Amino acid sequence: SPLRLDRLRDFVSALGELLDRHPDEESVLREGRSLLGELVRHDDWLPEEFAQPDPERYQQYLLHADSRQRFSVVSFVWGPGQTTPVHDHRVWGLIGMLRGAEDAQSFELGAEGLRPIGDPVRLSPGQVEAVSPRIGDIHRVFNASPDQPSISIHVYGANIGAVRRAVYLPDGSEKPFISGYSNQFLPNIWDQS
Amino acid sequence: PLRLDRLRDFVSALGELLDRHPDEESVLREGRSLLGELVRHDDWLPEEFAQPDPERYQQYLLHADSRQRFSVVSFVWGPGQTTPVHDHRVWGLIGMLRGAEDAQSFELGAEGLRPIGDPVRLSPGQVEAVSPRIGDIHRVFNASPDQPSISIHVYGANIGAVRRAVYLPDGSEKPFISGYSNQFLPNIWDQSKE
Ligand SMILES: [Cl-]
Ligand SMILES: [Cl-]
Ligand SMILES: [Fe+3]
Ligand SMILES: [Fe+3]
């Protein structure tokens, strides 16, 4: 069956249109999660190259970055019982669940250190959550299945791989964090023939 | 070590330029300055997107804007290869990178196609322009008979998807969609590997 890359091309174009109306963070997340919902509902477009689990670390595959680094679209792929560290973003983010099962535990900086702010959010294909400095920026995403891999498409208000942000230890101390990317090549979504 | 930052900085600068909603005259003038800065140094283009094919000239997409405002393409000619006579129907900038190639501009006359001028002889660093306004029809071809030739083309669209035309000797249009030779683009956005 032929890969429907047009889905990703159309998402990027729509998200470009959105950010050229110079909107506020409240409106970007509200309309953005609608567009990301439309993308991750169908699992027939992500090239197999950017769905591959590594057995040592979770993989971060860049799919597209805006010319002006306004935004970026990244495929995160967790192998069985893998996890991100506790981390912030320092920009608006949208996590769209695509394949498998993973949980997102939100965190807050308290006196004692890190305190989990709420119950682990349980994501199934199609579900879209948000993160930002304004609404709650610290979390930990991890694969719920112990045998299957899990994939989600993340969208950020920057080139997320180059952002100077932080991971957090139990006592609540920051360490500098630049995530980078797992791929040396992006997919060509622009050949409409 | 590949200086991909050069291409990242060009794309960002060209993004800034087009968000000031400038006229075609100003885009070409400031654009050819930025493209000049890129193609003067030949230490950034990944080898994967510099490969000649022995049958047809290769068109490798390096970057496309989110809104399809512009695209940056590596064109690679093998020995004694050539494009057909073609138009663009958008503003274009051809930056010469490696080897030697000539660009013969054309005009549609009564008899058909007549070459409008002498073949423009491009050497590494040289930047020319094309558009409907200033002269849209040309033919780019490798001047060397043994070396390959490469130039970085920048267009005011996603050039591979534009419905444009090739031209035959008698001057008759055939529809033309060029597409791209590559299934993968280079990742110019991982700054943490420097
Ligand atoms: Cl506390
Ligand atoms: Cl003409
Ligand atoms: Fe995150
Ligand atoms: Fe051309």
Numbering used by the authors:
A (entry chain C): 4 to 196
B (entry chain B): 5 to 198
Text of the article:
Thiol dioxygenases are a subset of nonheme iron oxygenases that catalyze the formation of sulfinic acids from sulfhydryl-containing substrates and dioxygen. Av3MDO exhibits the classic thiol dioxygenase cupin fold consisting of three N-terminal alpha-helices followed by a series of 11 β-strands forming the cupin β-barrel structure that houses the enzymatic active site. Like in Pa3MDO and other thiol dioxygenases, the iron center of Av3MDO is coordinated by three His residues (90, 92, and 142) contained within the conserved cupin motifs. The moderately hydrophobic dimer interface buries an average of ∼1260 Å2 (1199–1322 Å2 depending on the specific dimer pair) or ∼13% of the total monomer surface area and is structurally similar to the dimers observed for 3MDOs from other bacteria, all suggesting that it represents a physiologically relevant assembly.
